[PDB]
Amino acid sequence: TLRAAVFDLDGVLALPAVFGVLGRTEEALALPRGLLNDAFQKGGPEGATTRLMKGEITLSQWIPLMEENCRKCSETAKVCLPKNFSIKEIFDKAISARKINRPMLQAALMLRKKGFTTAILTNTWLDDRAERDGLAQLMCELKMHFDFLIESCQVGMVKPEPQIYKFLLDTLKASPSEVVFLDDIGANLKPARDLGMVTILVQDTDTALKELEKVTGIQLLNTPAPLPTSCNPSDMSHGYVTVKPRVRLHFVELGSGPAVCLCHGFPESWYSWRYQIPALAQAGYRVLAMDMKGYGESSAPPEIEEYCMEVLCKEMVTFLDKLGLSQAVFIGHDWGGMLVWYMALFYPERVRAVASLNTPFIPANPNMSPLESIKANPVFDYQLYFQEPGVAEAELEQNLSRTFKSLFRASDESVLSMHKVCEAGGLFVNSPEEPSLSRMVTEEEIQFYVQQFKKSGFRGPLNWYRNMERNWKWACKSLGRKILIPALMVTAEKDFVLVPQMSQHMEDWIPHLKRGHIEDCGHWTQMDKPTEVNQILIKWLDSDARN
Amino acid sequence: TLRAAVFDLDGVLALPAVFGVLGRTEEALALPRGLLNDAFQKGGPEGATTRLMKGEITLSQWIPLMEENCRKCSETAKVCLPKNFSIKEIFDKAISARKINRPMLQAALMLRKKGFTTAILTNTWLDDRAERDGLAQLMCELKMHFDFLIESCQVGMVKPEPQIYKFLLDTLKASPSEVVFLDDIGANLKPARDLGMVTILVQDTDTALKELEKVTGIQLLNTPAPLPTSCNPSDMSHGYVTVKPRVRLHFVELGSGPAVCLCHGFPESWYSWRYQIPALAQAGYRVLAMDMKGYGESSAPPEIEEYCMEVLCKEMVTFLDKLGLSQAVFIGHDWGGMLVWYMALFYPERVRAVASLNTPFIPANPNMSPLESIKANPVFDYQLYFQEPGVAEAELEQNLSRTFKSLFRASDESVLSMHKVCEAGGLFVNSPEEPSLSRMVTEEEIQFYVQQFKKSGFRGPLNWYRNMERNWKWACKSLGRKILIPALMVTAEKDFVLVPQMSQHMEDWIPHLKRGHIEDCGHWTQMDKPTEVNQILIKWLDSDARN
Numbered sequence A, B: 001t002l003r004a005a006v007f008d009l010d011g012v013l014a015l016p017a018v019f020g021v022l023g024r025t026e027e028a029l030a031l032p033r034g035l036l037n038d039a040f041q042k043g044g045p046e047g048a049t050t051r052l053m054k055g056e057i058t059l060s061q062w063i064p065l066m067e068e069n070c071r072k073c074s075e076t077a078k079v080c081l082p083k084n085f086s087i088k089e090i091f092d093k094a095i096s097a098r099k100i101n102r103p104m105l106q107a108a109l110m111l112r113k114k115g116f117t118t119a120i121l122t123n124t125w126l127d128d129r130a131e132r133d134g135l136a137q138l139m140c141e142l143k144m145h146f147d148f149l150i151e152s153c154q155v156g157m158v159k160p161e162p163q164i165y166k167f168l169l170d171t172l173k174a175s176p177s178e179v180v181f182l183d184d185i186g187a188n189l190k191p192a193r194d195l196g197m198v199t200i201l202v203q204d205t206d207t208a209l210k211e212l213e214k215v216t217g218i219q220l221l222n223t224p225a226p227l228p229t230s231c232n233p234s235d236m237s238h239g240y241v242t243v244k245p246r247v248r249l250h251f252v253e254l255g256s257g258p259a260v261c262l263c264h265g266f267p268e269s270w271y272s273w274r275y276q277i278p279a280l281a282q283a284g285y286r287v288l289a290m291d292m293k294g295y296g297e298s299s300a301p302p303e304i305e306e307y308c309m310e311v312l313c314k315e316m317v318t319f320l321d322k323l324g325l326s327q328a329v330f331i332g333h334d335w336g337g338m339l340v341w342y343m344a345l346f347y348p349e350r351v352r353a354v355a356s357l358n359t360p361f362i363p364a365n366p367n368m369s370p371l372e373s374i375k376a377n378p379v380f381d382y383q384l385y386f387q388e389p390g391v392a393e394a395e396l397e398q399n400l401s402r403t404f405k406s407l408f409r410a411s412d413e414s415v416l417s418m419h420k421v422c423e424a425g426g427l428f429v430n431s432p433e434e435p436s437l438s439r440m441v442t443e444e445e446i447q448f449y450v451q452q453f454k455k456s457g458f459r460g461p462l463n464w465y466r467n468m469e470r471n472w473k474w475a476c477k478s479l480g481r482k483i484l485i486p487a488l489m490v491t492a493e494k495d496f497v498l499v500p501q502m503s504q505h506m507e508d509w510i511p512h513l514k515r516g517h518i519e520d521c522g523h524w525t526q527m528d529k530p531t532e533v534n535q536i537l538i539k540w541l542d543s544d545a546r547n
């Protein structure tokens, strides 16, 4: 029985193959057939290319040797090469043109998801070209999805030498009959077959995947649309900044480029952005996913006033100051979305662009107390239940697993009616003791939230709701302002609390506002519809937030 | 007696003043004198500018109101404005032209260094212009050097209103007679004087500083060249990455832009880069200053082999993978400099550029054992003493304060002869029990190193020297390669171990190598000559490593 899958890089996990460019250059330049492919393999195991593939020399050192071989080949075939011909130019274009073969990667992901050990086995070089970063980025994206990456130039062994295959089996800790090996070069496939490994000669992806499905007994082709890459908490870079004596902010950091600061809602975590973090970083941004004050590994002081918008915003500005960031794009959801609109209103010089999921921007009413305003809308009754210190803490902290299982549910699975919460006497009064697991979350993801909330509980998080008057007085100072920096409002069709309709007057205050809308999406936007969230954010970031 | 100094921003800490541009535009456009300055102050306390300065409206909202006032002013003076005239263009250029007044900042730094509480008090606006980042960067650089920053648009009060002065005194927790106030606008200086504050009308900086010196009794003018900004450990962003089960790497992070990974030597810390971190970040780079494996808050496993170059380099590649960085520029010193040359040789695709302080690149000799090579040079005797497990640990761990005080010394202060260390029986055998404090370090900086080394001691750090054979075998695999990515070699005239002369053949292997050289500089390069290190690195980074 198979339990390991090995993939080549060129012509298998990445397309078009670099080998095919030598043939394509011959055809485009009307050179004798196989002239370039011949100079490429010149000397065989003792030639320049084998030395390159074993790591003896670098790609930049190999370029002049390939050039000499091209001259030697043209001399024998009694032909000439053009006076503008460049091996460097040919390879720069070929490497840049080569992209990940998405259905092949999806097949490897599916096999690993079922318990397979996956590995990339590749004949590659030490790239010291001025444009080497492109290949580095490609290898970085691919490698994270595999258990092992074995590169010829690093191991000093090359395909088809039999030692690289014995090395492969040793790293896999598996016998050959347990291994599937996919390669586009038949000669490189031969030693694996000789050892008794299942082999697949890859020409077109579709046929290779049909062969792969048949031999593994796992559906890999025509399979449903997969979820974006998630985060494993133990594999992230964790950052810690002291914003003041008793307050430290924790964040997870991934990627390079313009800083994008992700701000979660209630009662969440940096982990609520698990599907956005790898996508945004891959898109060319430096992601900073916060544990907001009161949550996870960030400090949770008990005082109500430590959680008013004015102090929370001041602390986020201090956070940028301590990291040495003059700006960041601010993206928020729920309470994080409210924070992000206030960052834009009070600190525009520090906000590259602002985006909110679900939370609209509604200017404070100076002629009405914030308490009356909340009372006017039946769906905001849960906010009134949250006012009395200790009451919601007790119910929310009683059973953490039940708390997150009851709250985190999709539109068609709801267990909590947020109207008449005070009258009923709690959020979970007509809720089961052992709620069913939502389709949006695994049991493991629920337990992460459970473990995070074991540290500080719900006091700090509930305090975000306990500053209605303080926030209202501060917000009233901004009533003459308009938001004129780049802004995105993302509405969720089925969020019955933060309804899309509540955002309808936003262009009165944000005239240049851009919009996104997600159908069949509840309140937990990021995990309800991750693919569409990622699509909307990446499109808006690339157009309005730079790169 | 004075104990507080307050500085205005425009015309005081930053020059040329924005006010002077209104007058300059009038002269350049041959408009009636004071026409623009008149439209600017139109309406006085009820006018558009006061609303802007109090935070009622943003700068982008103010621009059309200033334009209308310019029209109203030209109508009264019976003149016309050009058909290309733009308030936005005038202010964009003025703000961009305004830079920190370096001698004024140096005076504030000196006063704060002597125990003064310092503050910036400024009439400013909420900047939402597309080019607002420039001003944000300027405010970021300035604010870090002061105890308080009070901005009119944030406090809703403006100079010369008397409430902003009472607010200033309340934040300072000081009586007026204890306060010096520097302003370039006499009217704004008046209420401070009325309260009994010492005031200085700033026209030219030099005269203002002579007045400041006279009144404080502290030398501020003609003073020696100050050291670059250092780091306060508790004010940094601290990052943590697990590179494998028992190994976590700690780093300090500051700034935005291309990633610059700083790699210290033996027996050091991320803190050895304290003078480079703020300079490199201010220069437009994202700095990652490592605690190398075996040091500070990074893991320190006991096994010798955990510290061979091959594993250390693999872990640094994993560190970039986990942070989502396809590349970083690698800058190393001593053991860090050796690590950085091997990163360039084995992982060029991940190395944007490479720089070494003191450590030259010398290819391994395949015809001689590394032990014989070390024996051939008398200055490398300390390396032989470091070979036996437990011996150097005992001497180095016996008294930490004595250890760092004896090692960290400038060229003219040395207490340790590194020849005949084994024969003598240790590094500190002819060394005092209570060494004098070097001019390079404060007692506080020594105690930071003492506290860091209390965690793991010297076993992990000493193990970097215990892999001579392993490193030699690995290095021999790279003997056919050349370093062809951008490289900088920085030599220190007076380092008697890593002598400048040992780097003389480096262009045989790094043909495009760039160089830096520091005279009257010992082994502890970064702290011996921080100003010159910063100058050399920033110049090479800007020319060869991007931005």
Ligand SMILES: O=C1COc2ccc(Cl)cc2N1
Pocket (backbone or CB within 6 Å): A266, A267, A407, A495, A496, A497, A498, A522, A523
């Ligand atoms: O379904 C929803 C929508 O709005 C909400 C708002 C707040 C909280 Cl705590 C939960 C939900 N759940």
Ligand SMILES: O=C1COc2ccc(Cl)cc2N1
Pocket (backbone or CB within 6 Å): B266, B267, B407, B495, B496, B497, B498, B522, B523
């Ligand atoms: O003065 C010096 C120069 O070289 C050195 C090399 C290693 C160590 Cl641990 C100390 C020093 N000190």
